Design a protein around this nucleic acid. Structure first.
Length: 82
RNA sequence: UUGGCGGAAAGGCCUUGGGUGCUUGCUGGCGAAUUGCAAUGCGUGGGGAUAAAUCAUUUGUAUACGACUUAGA
């Protein structure tokens, strides 16, 4: 914060990479039934509830039906049913 | 547990009878969580008894040396 650099490491250039919201595939819609391909609950059927700002999908089993609680999941490890 | 069957490398096929579990065929309840967003998720090396082999002896229907051929608790 206030310590002067004791070794003049070169500063990084102005990176021209602005963050953009994830463009999820149209097949992913809220309320869709999802199949988990990996992780603790791999192979379980899950319901798509909400999209999170961290590029993850807020999902629920529901917990009562199959024991899968509210957890974050990646869209790339999920198959969206009709 | 009963009966038959499979010889090509059968060694497998059913099957009468009962025993004990599941049944998602149908109706419901209990728990999943925090692993936190994926890192696939089987015989020795030393002893106790002993079935058998080789050597010793002998044998000669065998013989350059191995090998082969007999018999004595």
């Amino acid at each position: 914060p206030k310590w002067y650099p004791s070794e003049d490491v070169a500063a990084l250039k102005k990176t021209r990479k602005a963050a953009r919201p994830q463009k999820l595939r149209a097949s992913l819609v809220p309320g869709t039934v999802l199949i988990l391909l990996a992780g603790r609950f791999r192979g379980k059927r899950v319901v798509y509830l909400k999209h999170l700002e961290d590029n993850t999908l807020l999902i629920s089993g529901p917990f009562k039906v199959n024991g899968v609680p509210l957890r974050r999941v990646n869209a790339r490890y999920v198959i969206a049913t009709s």
